[PDB]
Design a protein around this ligand. Structure first.
Ligand SMILES: O=C(O)CCCCCNC(=O)Cc1cc([N+](=O)O)c(O)c([N+](=O)O)c1
Length: 236
């Protein structure tokens, strides 16, 4: 498609009880409702959870202090009354016609002590080891919801580096959509009996060494629930 780049504040510092606004900028112009801005939180030990999707739709269970909107020419995530548990990295994802593009993440620091305001599962193997040229098939067991009513996304993360969207599958149809970056490198499959989604990475290389996440998605909403990620390493 294009060479779109999504930009966020590198860092923000707040205190418990303050209102902080994280923004998400598009290098192609203004962020629009057609970019269906998603917001995803990364807590220590690489625990990802979706907060907002489709600009302003609230993922399930997300606290009332979080809200999403367009402010001027950017998407915005607003925390009205930050709490110490909100210290984390916040990623925004924008839809560019045929692919999701992640920003670089905002590291939110909450300084000082404070108070504040106090089922689905996706299971992924911890690691999978492979030598160059071989193939790995990655599993993502879904539990707690109707498997076919929700899309599945896969995301690649080279630690210390950004997030890359790989592709999506609709379990009710098998209809797929792949990032052109991975169109022949990866194939998404689903086993409705065992309610399990799979990804096969044919003919690996050294770049393919990264953690691979699966993430459930309800269209027009958020990439809410994320697997723990499978750290695929390549012998070298
Ligand atoms: O199916 C329906 O009911 C309606 C669906 C389209 C309307 C809402 N669009 C999105 O949420 C953003 C998005 C659009 C896609 N598209 O429409 O091409 C995708 O393929 C895709 N993805 O993740 O792959 C993500």
């Amino acid at each position: 498609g294009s060479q779109a780049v999504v930009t966020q504040e590198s860092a923000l510092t707040t205190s418990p009880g303050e209102t902080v606004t994280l923004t998400c900028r598009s290098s192609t112009g203004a962020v629009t409702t057609s970019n269906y801005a998603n917001w995803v939180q990364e807590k220590p030990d690489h625990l990802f959870t979706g907060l907002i999707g489709g600009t302003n739709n609230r993922a399930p269970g997300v606290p009332a202090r979080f809200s999403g909107s367009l402010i001027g020419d950017k998407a915005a995530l607003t925390i009205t009354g930050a709490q110490t548990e909100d210290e984390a990295i916040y990623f925004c994802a924008l839809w560019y016609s045929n692919r999701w593009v992640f920003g670089g993440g905002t590291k939110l620091t909450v300084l000082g002590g404070g108070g504040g305001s106090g089922q689905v599962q996706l299971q992924q193997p911890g690691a999978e080891l492979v030598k160059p040229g071989a193939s790995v098939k990655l599993s993502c067991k879904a539990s707690g919801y109707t498997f076919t009513s929700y899309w599945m996304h896969w995301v690649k993360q080279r630690p210390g580096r950004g997030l890359e969207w790989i592709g999506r599958i609709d379990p009710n149809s098998g209809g797929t959509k792949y990032n052109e970056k991975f169109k022949s490198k990866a194939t998404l499959t689903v086993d409705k009996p065992s309610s399990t989604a799979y990804m096969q990475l044919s003919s690996l290389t050294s770049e393919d060494s990264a953690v691979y996440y699966c993430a459930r998605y309800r269209v027009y909403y958020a990439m809410d629930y994320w697997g723990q990620g499978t750290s695929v390493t390549v012998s070298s």
